[PDB]
Design a protein around this ligand. Structure first.
Ligand SMILES: O=C(O)Cc1c2ccccc2n2c1[nH]c(=O)c1ccccc12
Length: 325
């Protein structure tokens, strides 16, 4: 399997572009940035709002927890390569604590309202607007030969007041190389694509489109997470109960994948549940025929079947967003 678009991006570019291991970090001054207040945390870092003591402007300080040098260089290289792109967070500096060598990534400031409180207030148009903005970021990184691999509300910072969006945390991102077999232990469970759940390793940019689809489904149906599995096996089960097992079998046979007998047993057999059956009094104001058609073209077992980010942006669902912009 290979990407249907942007497959040769890293083939045509200098090795220095994607060979992140060859990178030699040019450390700045740790003293230049002071922590003001904690704003977030994850299993790989702690994030704070900070201040640049030289110009006194706000910034974001991401202090990384102890991890391998290879992974830290990967995130830095990807951030440098994407800097300046549409709605991509901007890496400004890279510093480390002299004594313990704890690294911190410094970013342009971005305000945010946790999606749990923001999303319930988004109007029909707001959803079209923000998803379009996220798509700009995804088509951009994909066009630059990079898969984010961790698309989820938590990594989509939105300043609702300014209506500004930023795709953050590129710690799981990777460069796409045709034929490469990647680690399937990426993204967050509720947003993992079928390919990861069935161990199909030669995946591509399309993985992010499934995750986007999960996020989108959660938004229009007011059900977060849309696919609520407890462990990786259960995650595939929940997906199967919605898309149906018939399409799963077509997928598995096409890519010659054999499911673990245990997992196969858990999945069982299920008919497809139409998207319309997810509509209720709580989401009726957001479920339009265009939204459903768009969602349908994202949540497909077969990654090669999903809309690319570029195609997604042209879907009629976003017609007013385009006309306006
Ligand atoms: O790039 C990253 O890995 C994290 C990042 C990040 C990177 C750039 C700008 C803001 C960023 N933020 C975060 N993480 C947060 O939890 C957060 C919470 C509130 C407001 C902003 C946050």
């Amino acid at each position: 399997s290979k990407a249907r678009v942007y497959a040769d991006v890293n083939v045509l570019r200098p090795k220095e572009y994607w060979d992140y291991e060859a990178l030699t970090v040019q450390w700045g001054e740790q003293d230049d940035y002071e922590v003001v207040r904690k704003v977030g945390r994850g299993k790989y870092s702690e994030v704070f709002e900070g201040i640049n003591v030289n110009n006194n402007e706000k910034c974001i300080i991401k202090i990384l927890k102890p991890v391998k040098k290879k992974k830290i260089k990967r995130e830095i290289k990807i951030l440098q390569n994407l800097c300046g792109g549409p709605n991509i967070v901007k890496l400004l500096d890279i510093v480390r604590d002299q004594h313990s060598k704890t690294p911190s990534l410094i970013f342009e400031y971005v305000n945010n309202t946790d999606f749990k409180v923001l999303y319930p207030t988004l109007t029909d148009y707001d959803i079209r607007y923000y998803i379009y903005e996220l798509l700009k970021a995804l088509d951009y990184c994909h066009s630059q030969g990079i898969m984010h691999r961790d698309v989820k509300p938590h990594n989509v910072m939105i300043d609702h007041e300014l209506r500004k969006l930023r795709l953050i945390d590129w710690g799981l991102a990777e460069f796409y190389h045709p034929g490469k077999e990647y680690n399937v232990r990426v993204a967050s469970r509720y947003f993992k694509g079928p390919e990861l759940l069935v161990d199909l390793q030669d995946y591509d940019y399309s993985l992010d489109m499934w995750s986007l689809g999960c996020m989108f489904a959660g938004m229009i149906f007011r059900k977060e997470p849309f696919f609520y599995g407890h462990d990786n096996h259960d995650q595939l089960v929940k997906i199967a109960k919605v898309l149906g097992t018939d399409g799963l079998n077509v997928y598995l046979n096409k890519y010659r994948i054999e499911l673990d007998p245990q997992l196969e047993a858990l999945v069982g057999r299920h008919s497809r549940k139409p998207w319309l059956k997810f509509m209720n009094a709580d989401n009726q104001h957001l479920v339009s025929p265009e939204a459903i058609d768009f969602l349908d073209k994202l949540l497909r077992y077969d990654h090669q079947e999903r809309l690319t980010a570029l195609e997604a942006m042209t879907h009629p669902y976003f017609q007013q967003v385009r006309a306006a912009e």
